[PDB]
Amino acid sequence: AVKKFKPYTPSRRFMTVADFSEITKTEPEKSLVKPLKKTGGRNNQGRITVRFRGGGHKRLYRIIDFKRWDKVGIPAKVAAIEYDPNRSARIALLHYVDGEKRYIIAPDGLQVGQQVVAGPDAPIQVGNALPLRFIPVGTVVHAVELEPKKGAKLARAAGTSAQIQGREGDYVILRLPSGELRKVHGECYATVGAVGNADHKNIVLGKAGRSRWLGRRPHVRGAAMNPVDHPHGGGEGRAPRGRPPASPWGWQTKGLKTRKRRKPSSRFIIAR
Amino acid sequence: MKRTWQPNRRKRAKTHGFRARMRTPGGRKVLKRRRQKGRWRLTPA
RNA sequence: GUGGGAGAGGGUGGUGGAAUUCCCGGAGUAGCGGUGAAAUGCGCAGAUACCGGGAGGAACGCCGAUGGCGAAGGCAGCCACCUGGUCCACCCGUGACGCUGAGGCGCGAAAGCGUGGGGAGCAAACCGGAUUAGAUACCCGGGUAGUCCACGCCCUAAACG
RNA sequence: CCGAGGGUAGGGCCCGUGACUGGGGCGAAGUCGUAACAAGGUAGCUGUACCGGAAGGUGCGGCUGGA
RNA sequence: CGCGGGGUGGAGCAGCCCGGUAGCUCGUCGGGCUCAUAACCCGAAGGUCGUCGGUUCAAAUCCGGCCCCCGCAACCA
RNA sequence: GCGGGGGGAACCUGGGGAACUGAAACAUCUCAGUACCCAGAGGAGAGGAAAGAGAAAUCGACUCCCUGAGUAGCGGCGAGC
RNA sequence: CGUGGUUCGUGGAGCCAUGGGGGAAUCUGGGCGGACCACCGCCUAAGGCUAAGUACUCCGGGUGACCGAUAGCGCACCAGU
RNA sequence: GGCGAGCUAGCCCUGGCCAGGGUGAAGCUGGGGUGAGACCCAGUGGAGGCCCGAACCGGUGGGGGAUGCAAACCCCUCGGA
RNA sequence: UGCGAAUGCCGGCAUGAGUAACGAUAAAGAGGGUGAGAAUCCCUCUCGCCGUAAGCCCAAGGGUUCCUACGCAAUGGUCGUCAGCGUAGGGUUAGGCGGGACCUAAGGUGAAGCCGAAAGGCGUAGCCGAAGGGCAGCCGGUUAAUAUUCCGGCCCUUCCCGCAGGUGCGAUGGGGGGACGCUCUAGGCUAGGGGGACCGGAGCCAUGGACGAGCCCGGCCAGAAGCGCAGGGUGGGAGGUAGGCAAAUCCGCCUCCCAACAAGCUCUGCGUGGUGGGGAAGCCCGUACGGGUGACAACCCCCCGAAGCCAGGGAGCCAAGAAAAGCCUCUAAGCACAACCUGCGGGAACCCGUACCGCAAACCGACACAGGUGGGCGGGUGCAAGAGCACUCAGGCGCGCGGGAGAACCCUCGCCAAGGAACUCUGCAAGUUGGCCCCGUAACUUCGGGAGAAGGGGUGCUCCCUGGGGUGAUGAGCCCCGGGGAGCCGCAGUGAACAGGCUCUGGCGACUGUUUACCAAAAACACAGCUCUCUGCGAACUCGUAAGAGGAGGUAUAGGGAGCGACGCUUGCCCGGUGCCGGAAGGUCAAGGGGAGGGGUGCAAGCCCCGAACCGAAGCCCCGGUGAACGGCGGCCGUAACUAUAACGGUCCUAAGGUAGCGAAAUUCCUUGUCGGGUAAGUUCCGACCUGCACGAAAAGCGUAACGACCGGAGCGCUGUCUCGGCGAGGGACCCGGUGAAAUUGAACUGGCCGUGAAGAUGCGGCCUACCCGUGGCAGGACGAAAAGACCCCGUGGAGCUUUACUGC
RNA sequence: CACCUCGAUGUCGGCUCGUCGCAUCCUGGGGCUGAAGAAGGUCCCAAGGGUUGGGCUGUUCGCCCAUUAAAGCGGCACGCG
Ligand SMILES: [Mg+2]
Ligand SMILES: [Mg+2]
Ligand SMILES: [Mg+2]
Ligand SMILES: [Mg+2]
Ligand SMILES: [Mg+2]
Ligand SMILES: [Mg+2]
Ligand SMILES: [Mg+2]
Ligand SMILES: [Mg+2]
Ligand SMILES: [Mg+2]
Ligand SMILES: [Mg+2]
Ligand SMILES: [Mg+2]
Ligand SMILES: [Mg+2]
Ligand SMILES: [Mg+2]
Ligand SMILES: [Mg+2]
Ligand SMILES: [Mg+2]
Ligand SMILES: [Mg+2]
Ligand SMILES: [Mg+2]
Ligand SMILES: [Mg+2]
Ligand SMILES: [Mg+2]
Ligand SMILES: [Mg+2]
Ligand SMILES: [Mg+2]
Ligand SMILES: [Mg+2]
Ligand SMILES: [Mg+2]
Ligand SMILES: [Mg+2]
Ligand SMILES: [Mg+2]
Ligand SMILES: [Mg+2]
Ligand SMILES: [Mg+2]
Ligand SMILES: [Mg+2]
Ligand SMILES: [Mg+2]
Ligand SMILES: [Mg+2]
Ligand SMILES: [Mg+2]
Ligand SMILES: [Mg+2]
Ligand SMILES: [Mg+2]
Ligand SMILES: [Mg+2]
Ligand SMILES: [Mg+2]
Ligand SMILES: [Mg+2]
Ligand SMILES: [Mg+2]
Ligand SMILES: [Mg+2]
Ligand SMILES: [Mg+2]
Ligand SMILES: [Mg+2]
Ligand SMILES: [Mg+2]
Ligand SMILES: [Mg+2]
Ligand SMILES: [Mg+2]
Ligand SMILES: [Mg+2]
Ligand SMILES: [Mg+2]
Ligand SMILES: [Mg+2]
Ligand SMILES: [Mg+2]
Ligand SMILES: [Mg+2]
Ligand SMILES: [Mg+2]
Ligand SMILES: [Mg+2]
Ligand SMILES: [Mg+2]
Ligand SMILES: [Mg+2]
Ligand SMILES: [Mg+2]
Ligand SMILES: [Mg+2]
Ligand SMILES: [Mg+2]
Ligand SMILES: [Mg+2]
Ligand SMILES: [Mg+2]
Ligand SMILES: [Mg+2]
Ligand SMILES: [Mg+2]
Ligand SMILES: [Mg+2]
Ligand SMILES: [Mg+2]
Ligand SMILES: [Mg+2]
Ligand SMILES: [Mg+2]
Ligand SMILES: [Mg+2]
Ligand SMILES: [Mg+2]
Ligand SMILES: [Mg+2]
Ligand SMILES: [Mg+2]
Ligand SMILES: [Mg+2]
Ligand SMILES: [Mg+2]
Ligand SMILES: [Mg+2]
Ligand SMILES: [Mg+2]
Ligand SMILES: [Mg+2]
Ligand SMILES: [Mg+2]
Ligand SMILES: [Mg+2]
Ligand SMILES: [Mg+2]
Ligand SMILES: [Mg+2]
Ligand SMILES: [Mg+2]
Ligand SMILES: [Mg+2]
Ligand SMILES: [Mg+2]
Ligand SMILES: [Mg+2]
Ligand SMILES: [Mg+2]
Ligand SMILES: [Mg+2]
Ligand SMILES: [Mg+2]
Ligand SMILES: [Mg+2]
Ligand SMILES: [Mg+2]
Ligand SMILES: [Mg+2]
Ligand SMILES: [Mg+2]
Ligand SMILES: [Mg+2]
Ligand SMILES: [Mg+2]
Ligand SMILES: [Mg+2]
Ligand SMILES: [Mg+2]
Ligand SMILES: [Mg+2]
Ligand SMILES: [Mg+2]
Ligand SMILES: [Mg+2]
Ligand SMILES: [Mg+2]
Ligand SMILES: [Mg+2]
Ligand SMILES: [Mg+2]
Ligand SMILES: [Mg+2]
Ligand SMILES: [Mg+2]
Ligand SMILES: [Mg+2]
Ligand SMILES: [Mg+2]
Ligand SMILES: [Mg+2]
Ligand SMILES: [Mg+2]
Ligand SMILES: [Mg+2]
Ligand SMILES: [Mg+2]
Ligand SMILES: [Mg+2]
Ligand SMILES: [Mg+2]
Ligand SMILES: [Mg+2]
Ligand SMILES: [Mg+2]
Ligand SMILES: [Mg+2]
Ligand SMILES: [Mg+2]
Ligand SMILES: [Mg+2]
Ligand SMILES: [Mg+2]
Ligand SMILES: [Mg+2]
Ligand SMILES: [Mg+2]
Ligand SMILES: [Mg+2]
Ligand SMILES: [Mg+2]
Ligand SMILES: [Mg+2]
Ligand SMILES: [Mg+2]
Ligand SMILES: [Mg+2]
Ligand SMILES: [Mg+2]
Ligand SMILES: [Mg+2]
Ligand SMILES: [Mg+2]
Ligand SMILES: [Mg+2]
Ligand SMILES: [Mg+2]
Ligand SMILES: [Mg+2]
Ligand SMILES: [Mg+2]
Ligand SMILES: [Mg+2]
Ligand SMILES: [Mg+2]
Ligand SMILES: [Mg+2]
Ligand SMILES: [Mg+2]
Ligand SMILES: [Mg+2]
Ligand SMILES: [Mg+2]
Ligand SMILES: [Mg+2]
Ligand SMILES: [Mg+2]
Ligand SMILES: [Mg+2]
Ligand SMILES: [Mg+2]
Ligand SMILES: [Mg+2]
Ligand SMILES: [Mg+2]
Ligand SMILES: [Mg+2]
Ligand SMILES: [Mg+2]
Ligand SMILES: [Mg+2]
Ligand SMILES: [Mg+2]
Ligand SMILES: [Mg+2]
Ligand SMILES: [Mg+2]
Ligand SMILES: [Mg+2]
Ligand SMILES: [Mg+2]
Ligand SMILES: [Mg+2]
Ligand SMILES: [Mg+2]
Ligand SMILES: [Mg+2]
Ligand SMILES: [Mg+2]
Ligand SMILES: [Mg+2]
Ligand SMILES: [Mg+2]
Ligand SMILES: [Mg+2]
Ligand SMILES: [Mg+2]
Ligand SMILES: [Mg+2]
Ligand SMILES: [Mg+2]
Ligand SMILES: [Mg+2]
Ligand SMILES: [Mg+2]
Ligand SMILES: [Mg+2]
Ligand SMILES: [Mg+2]
Ligand SMILES: [Mg+2]
Ligand SMILES: [Mg+2]
Ligand SMILES: [Mg+2]
Ligand SMILES: [Mg+2]
């Protein structure tokens, strides 16, 4: 993985590019493609609600299958492994024997030419989606539903996975990529394997402009503002925080726990 | 050097135009005011 | 060559039990820990001791030896796959095809280093309690790198027979 | 044409010397402690690593040139 | 000059608020243990409280002055 | 089928509703239910025929003027209302 | 309970209104006379309409110890130009 | 209470532009090397917030201007390209 | 109801003043014309300027400025007979160009729906919305003024109707397609260009020579089908079928069978093509402008050659690169005497734009303003290349005051004896250097760099010989890249123009980048990268009362907040205080619950009111954790066998007493510390010492190659920076003619000194000096002008900002 | 000290241009000397003229280099924007 560069420019000395040898799709994408409305971090008022976004390459959205429980029993060949710009992971193209095509988010180890299937059936094998209740305790899995029929939510980022630690009633205990320990419903689908392209986290952006390609505009320290602008704005040189460290909106940014206390989901959580 | 006024006919009718004014309650009162004064033109040409 | 052996010899993947720690449940009360003796620490916010469940990492008790293997460093639960050396018998083949070896190349305990991961127990550094004239130690309570894995470095040693 | 050499520029090796600074050798009776030699009063040594006025201490592994 | 704190046995510090009898550690002295020193143990001595006035019955103590000390300040110019 | 819609100087009712200022500073208080914005009505609009007044065996819908009266009271018992 | 209206700024604070909670009765029922109780009175809430007396001045008219072209409306004049 | 992003700042959609030189990454190929490799050497290749420099975008230093040509300009010089 | 003041208001008219200025230093001269009047208008000649423009074409924007006749009050910076000006008349022609009776993008709007006191916000589909997609016209002639619009020639499109032939026809539904990046790029063309000894052509022989294979001018354009050349796109057949929200024979998917190729089929570019059309120099004609001839004009070879075309071409790369219609296919109801398809034929083909300016005198800049303004074309020669530089074509301009003079002084520019930074805050500025080819090239380094390091040599023209390419026949020609040899001239050969001065050594920042539009471009911001922290997804967080939305059609390898800021080596101790984190106990605690017990009133039943214990959240208290959380990290006294110093000790305090590294520093007050270095001499600078007023480890510590219009210090080179000035050029200044401002202004008949005076007198005193009035000059004074001091205070004036100020939200 | 000036009297240093004072740095003339000569010392007269070039610093000033007859001190809004 991880292409390096001789330093024939500054920032080429440190830059590091993804390895694309897993990818069979050359450029084009299957016309399960659809267009992406780039926000600029602006909401339906014209208002920036998320700072320092915008710019960056045009992208087509590849529509991807986060419920596998339509095609229950219908297998599919893995046609291609492709590049998807909207996610850390890679998408794998599936040709169903149905004749239908879907994109799956591509698991680690999954080969072009494999058969895949999803349902209460199905082997415990990489690619296969099952209700969680039927996945053997201990198997590591990705793309989990949190509640049944609602779509995969957990462990979709390149290299992530989750582990089945146990059963209790209609729920199973999972260990999320966060390390949190969560009861999830047994009925929820999941698909065995880790997500992979796990070398993803070692890319070294390497120069300013490469952050600009991903649509990340420069980020400015509160420390560098004036006090109109930020709790750290002010005061001659440099200067330390002068107060417990804050966000621009003034809440504390070291340690202050922000999850709502009375969330109903708390009955189903056990950890960090 | 580049000055403030850079006329473009679409922008103008899109902005101070008559239909523009009538959409917003704010703008209808501009018409109401301009009429009551006897402005020969309720709106830029 | 042929036929046979013994072996913690190496690499990869699996896998088992004991224990430690932490958590959950139970029962249960006034101390536990620790030492030369203590104190720090822990404990009525229910500790220790006891039982049930769970999680996680490391190391493999008896066998075990004054034993075996490897060139050396080293190598110890069990299973399979790949794989090195080695010895015995038969006396079949080649016909000196040998020894050694400056350079070269490769391997090389521990600690250390980089990038990830993993982190139970241990434990440099560090903190605290004792001791002492002092105690930057020895004993006690804590405790972070590290110890563990992958990849890549470092090349050292009472690397000793 | 070549040519002694002079000039101009840039390299290399060597010697001398330099505020200061690093250790080292030596020097009849200085100061601090006691690490080692006798379980040297914590067996000693050891590669390394961290720490500490100083000898050293501690960790990990090794040696017996110790019990 | 300004403001706040201080000055007490040989050293370093309490005591000063709140008037009446100066304490602590080290040091010093005499003894003990040791072959001896150090550690350790049993005894002891040592200060008029910077200085001069004042207040009171009584002043290290409360007040004033002078004297040294430590800290802070000296900006717009 | 019938209606609605939009406009109108000011005036009117209703929904909302400031500050400067005053208090010789300023928060309650004042400015003021003002300015203003919005809805609606009309030539007017509102209100109206007592579950009223309030000390007299009292008066009789509502509106408007005079008066009661700067009274009764209200009030960082201040400014002032 | 929370507020608004009233002269009433939490005051002894009723009355009228009502965002929230609980939540009746039909004359022997209910509301009110300034906390509350008695007595003695007043009135009949939770449906609706209702001229006139009132406000205004785009508009027409009549008057002025109103102006007379720097005044009087911003405009006496092809000015909201 | 309104009017403004025809200036300026950011973003969104959709187009356009960047003379000409220079340097020579990876890769590929070949050759060497090895037990196999790492690797080395060539040729090829044509990377880069890479170099020089117009257009274009700037605005570094100096001079001039200062009732200006100009309510920010002109000359020389200079940065990115 | 009386004005002299309010930097008053409105108007008028003065002063300054015939002063400054008349708007790029590209530049003018003369002859003729016209007219009342001519530097300024017209025409000729000559001269100068632009030429990747200062020429031409398009889009904005402007809106009659267009063409012409008559005209000069005003507008025009002068003049005006002219005009972008007055009056009047004329002038813009489209089925094919642009836009609309087509599509969708952001966004807007919005049946459904959702929210909101009202106003109104939101929102699926739909709809609107283009400089994107789709769509059929090319060449030439004509007008004073329009032309892909009129005309001429040659082509084409859609609707309607009919004929013929074909076929299950049929859609807003299903499917295909449309349909996509960046960089590099092949082959073949085309635009465009150069050359020709070949073809066509009026003429020309000057001034010494040339009647010549002389000079000069020109040698094309458009074109259906067909046909060539180059390219684009694309498999064909069968069987199965559960997917494409109905149904499909379509598409998808599995199987088999032939092609693997453009072979075919199709589509586009280019070439050729029936026909049509242009067609120079020169001479002549009166225009203000064009027209005749040249003429039956010629109309052809060679070469260069796109960034354009063939086009959806190819390759590589990561940052992964619109949509919908047109279009084709499939079927659906339906209809199959319909319908659709193909061909041909007749008809039918609407609205708006169309003048003119358009890098500017017509747009944005109050101006005929040296500013700003998107797209295309942009010729030739030379210089390595080029859109660069110089000169030039076509074409366009000499900038709407002029004439003279030849002072100071100013600006822009040229040169300079000897010296060479002595100048100065500083080499500021200006010099030097400068393009290409070759030789050559250090520390250090992250191995790329540093590097154009540095320092050098070459460079023109002539003749001779000779190598490789491209296109052509392997050939010549033409074109490209060279190699060797002998010579020639000058001061000089990148002969003009465009074109780095270099080195050593610190600080800061890693780097390219960003910024205070208009006094700061930096050491500030950003930046990859490191840490902490939050967030399990209807995520945290942000905007909104809400609905909604961003986050994100993302999911912990993700998202938010914060600090630090490549990289290297590192980042110590303190948890007492504050913050955050944990803690089911205990303490305190609001409403509420609870009512012991009390009260008002009533004859009483009762109504009414207080009300203790107790039970009651969060919060705080309390217990503990926490340092890339806010932050903090001692004092006095002694002590070594010279002295000094103090490894050592004592004692007070603390939550703990600053580790490594660094240190008179972007920090050091004393201070120009002391020593060393560089200098003849060094408050700066470099190195070092440590007595750090008052460094110190993610408001990071100490370093670091490379980078920098940053800031410091030193050398070489070279200089008008200077010793120290001089001369010269042009534009102003001066004079004459034309036009003619401004701030300012109590009035003026406005001298020096020494005094006096509200303390700095033209104005008062005393003396002295002094005929009236100007012009060019200098700036000492009128406490000169400008701006109701920006500092300072004052005001119970304001506003931005802060917090453990108060009070709220 | 707070008197003119806050409806503005621009502030250090440099440069340019000076002019004045004399408490004289030099040159001229003198007295005294603990003045042999030369060379000094000190004090008197004297303002005519003169009174250098560099290094360092923004500096005034000062220190230093090299010289000199000497390397004068003051004032003029710390002379002069
Ligand atoms: Mg909006
Ligand atoms: Mg971009
Ligand atoms: Mg930042
Ligand atoms: Mg700032
Ligand atoms: Mg703001
Ligand atoms: Mg703030
Ligand atoms: Mg701050
Ligand atoms: Mg500041
Ligand atoms: Mg600071
Ligand atoms: Mg700051
Ligand atoms: Mg978390
Ligand atoms: Mg304007
Ligand atoms: Mg437009
Ligand atoms: Mg616009
Ligand atoms: Mg009209
Ligand atoms: Mg074995
Ligand atoms: Mg044999
Ligand atoms: Mg090793
Ligand atoms: Mg190890
Ligand atoms: Mg652990
Ligand atoms: Mg300890
Ligand atoms: Mg101790
Ligand atoms: Mg332990
Ligand atoms: Mg070795
Ligand atoms: Mg020679
Ligand atoms: Mg020689
Ligand atoms: Mg030892
Ligand atoms: Mg010992
Ligand atoms: Mg010992
Ligand atoms: Mg020992
Ligand atoms: Mg040490
Ligand atoms: Mg230790
Ligand atoms: Mg060993
Ligand atoms: Mg003793
Ligand atoms: Mg006394
Ligand atoms: Mg201040
Ligand atoms: Mg109202
Ligand atoms: Mg107020
Ligand atoms: Mg007030
Ligand atoms: Mg007041
Ligand atoms: Mg006030
Ligand atoms: Mg009121
Ligand atoms: Mg009505
Ligand atoms: Mg009525
Ligand atoms: Mg009514
Ligand atoms: Mg009131
Ligand atoms: Mg009150
Ligand atoms: Mg009552
Ligand atoms: Mg009632
Ligand atoms: Mg009543
Ligand atoms: Mg009543
Ligand atoms: Mg009733
Ligand atoms: Mg009515
Ligand atoms: Mg009237
Ligand atoms: Mg008049
Ligand atoms: Mg008037
Ligand atoms: Mg009159
Ligand atoms: Mg008027
Ligand atoms: Mg904009
Ligand atoms: Mg261009
Ligand atoms: Mg390149
Ligand atoms: Mg570049
Ligand atoms: Mg450049
Ligand atoms: Mg400039
Ligand atoms: Mg005059
Ligand atoms: Mg004059
Ligand atoms: Mg003059
Ligand atoms: Mg003049
Ligand atoms: Mg002119
Ligand atoms: Mg001129
Ligand atoms: Mg040209
Ligand atoms: Mg137009
Ligand atoms: Mg105009
Ligand atoms: Mg006109
Ligand atoms: Mg005209
Ligand atoms: Mg005229
Ligand atoms: Mg005129
Ligand atoms: Mg006209
Ligand atoms: Mg036509
Ligand atoms: Mg449309
Ligand atoms: Mg809307
Ligand atoms: Mg369009
Ligand atoms: Mg178009
Ligand atoms: Mg068209
Ligand atoms: Mg034409
Ligand atoms: Mg059918
Ligand atoms: Mg052609
Ligand atoms: Mg002749
Ligand atoms: Mg030709
Ligand atoms: Mg002709
Ligand atoms: Mg392609
Ligand atoms: Mg449509
Ligand atoms: Mg036209
Ligand atoms: Mg242009
Ligand atoms: Mg023009
Ligand atoms: Mg002009
Ligand atoms: Mg212009
Ligand atoms: Mg103009
Ligand atoms: Mg621009
Ligand atoms: Mg431009
Ligand atoms: Mg060139
Ligand atoms: Mg040019
Ligand atoms: Mg000279
Ligand atoms: Mg020289
Ligand atoms: Mg310079
Ligand atoms: Mg060097
Ligand atoms: Mg060179
Ligand atoms: Mg020549
Ligand atoms: Mg050929
Ligand atoms: Mg040059
Ligand atoms: Mg250059
Ligand atoms: Mg420095
Ligand atoms: Mg920088
Ligand atoms: Mg750094
Ligand atoms: Mg650069
Ligand atoms: Mg910006
Ligand atoms: Mg900045
Ligand atoms: Mg600026
Ligand atoms: Mg500004
Ligand atoms: Mg810069
Ligand atoms: Mg600037
Ligand atoms: Mg870092
Ligand atoms: Mg909210
Ligand atoms: Mg959302
Ligand atoms: Mg989304
Ligand atoms: Mg920073
Ligand atoms: Mg730290
Ligand atoms: Mg420490
Ligand atoms: Mg703390
Ligand atoms: Mg704590
Ligand atoms: Mg704390
Ligand atoms: Mg409790
Ligand atoms: Mg209660
Ligand atoms: Mg509580
Ligand atoms: Mg605590
Ligand atoms: Mg410190
Ligand atoms: Mg220092
Ligand atoms: Mg120094
Ligand atoms: Mg400091
Ligand atoms: Mg200093
Ligand atoms: Mg010095
Ligand atoms: Mg230094
Ligand atoms: Mg820090
Ligand atoms: Mg540093
Ligand atoms: Mg810079
Ligand atoms: Mg830069
Ligand atoms: Mg000069
Ligand atoms: Mg001249
Ligand atoms: Mg006087
Ligand atoms: Mg007089
Ligand atoms: Mg008098
Ligand atoms: Mg003057
Ligand atoms: Mg004032
Ligand atoms: Mg105030
Ligand atoms: Mg005064
Ligand atoms: Mg003043
Ligand atoms: Mg003045
Ligand atoms: Mg004298
Ligand atoms: Mg003598
Ligand atoms: Mg004199
Ligand atoms: Mg200097
Ligand atoms: Mg000084
Ligand atoms: Mg003075
Ligand atoms: Mg002065
Ligand atoms: Mg000045």
PDB file of C-alpha atoms (C1' of nucleotides) in Angstrom, chain C residues 56-97:
ATOM      1  C1'   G C  56      -8.833  -9.143  28.136  1.00  0.00           C
ATOM      2  C1'   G C  57      -3.656 -10.019  27.755  1.00  0.00           C
ATOM      3  C1'   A C  58       0.421 -12.596  28.825  1.00  0.00           C
ATOM      4  C1'   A C  59       3.017 -17.174  30.167  1.00  0.00           C
ATOM      5  C1'   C C  60       2.595 -22.624  29.592  1.00  0.00           C
ATOM      6  C1'   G C  61       2.112 -26.298  35.916  1.00  0.00           C
ATOM      7  C1'   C C  62       3.072 -31.748  36.369  1.00  0.00           C
ATOM      8  C1'   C C  63       5.790 -34.335  32.456  1.00  0.00           C
ATOM      9  C1'   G C  64      11.103 -31.941  33.049  1.00  0.00           C
ATOM     10  C1'   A C  65      16.063 -34.347  33.846  1.00  0.00           C
ATOM     11  C1'   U C  66      22.529 -34.058  36.145  1.00  0.00           C
ATOM     12  C1'   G C  67      17.423 -34.580  29.245  1.00  0.00           C
ATOM     13  C1'   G C  68      16.728 -33.196  23.655  1.00  0.00           C
ATOM     14  C1'   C C  69      17.588 -29.748  19.082  1.00  0.00           C
ATOM     15  C1'   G C  70      20.362 -25.755  16.664  1.00  0.00           C
ATOM     16  C1'   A C  71      26.321 -22.865  13.646  1.00  0.00           C
ATOM     17  C1'   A C  72      25.549 -19.303  17.250  1.00  0.00           C
ATOM     18  C1'   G C  73      21.899 -15.971  19.365  1.00  0.00           C
ATOM     19  C1'   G C  74      18.501 -19.340  20.916  1.00  0.00           C
ATOM     20  C1'   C C  75      14.273 -23.093  21.035  1.00  0.00           C
ATOM     21  C1'   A C  76       9.227 -25.758  26.007  1.00  0.00           C
ATOM     22  C1'   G C  77       0.646 -26.435  26.451  1.00  0.00           C
ATOM     23  C1'   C C  78      -1.847 -29.136  22.297  1.00  0.00           C
ATOM     24  C1'   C C  79      -3.180 -29.430  16.707  1.00  0.00           C
ATOM     25  C1'   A C  80      -2.258 -29.146  11.406  1.00  0.00           C
ATOM     26  C1'   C C  81       0.394 -27.264   7.054  1.00  0.00           C
ATOM     27  C1'   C C  82       5.167 -25.788   5.019  1.00  0.00           C
ATOM     28  C1'   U C  83      10.413 -26.502   6.163  1.00  0.00           C
ATOM     29  C1'   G C  84      16.199 -26.970   7.910  1.00  0.00           C
ATOM     30  C1'   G C  85      19.812 -29.913   9.975  1.00  0.00           C
ATOM     31  C1'   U C  86      21.026 -34.759  11.696  1.00  0.00           C
ATOM     32  C1'   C C  87      22.062 -39.867  12.821  1.00  0.00           C
ATOM     33  C1'   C C  88      21.733 -45.520  11.749  1.00  0.00           C
ATOM     34  C1'   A C  89      21.579 -49.807   8.492  1.00  0.00           C
ATOM     35  C1'   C C  90      22.333 -51.801   3.483  1.00  0.00           C
ATOM     36  C1'   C C  91      27.379 -51.245   0.407  1.00  0.00           C
ATOM     37  C1'   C C  92      24.033 -49.646  -4.711  1.00  0.00           C
ATOM     38  C1'   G C  93      26.019 -44.918  -7.576  1.00  0.00           C
ATOM     39  C1'   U C  94      29.747 -40.619  -8.765  1.00  0.00           C
ATOM     40  C1'   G C  95      35.236 -40.847  -8.769  1.00  0.00           C
ATOM     41  C1'   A C  96      39.219 -36.396  -4.764  1.00  0.00           C
ATOM     42  C1'   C C  97      34.317 -33.859  -6.814  1.00  0.00           C
TER      43        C C  97
END
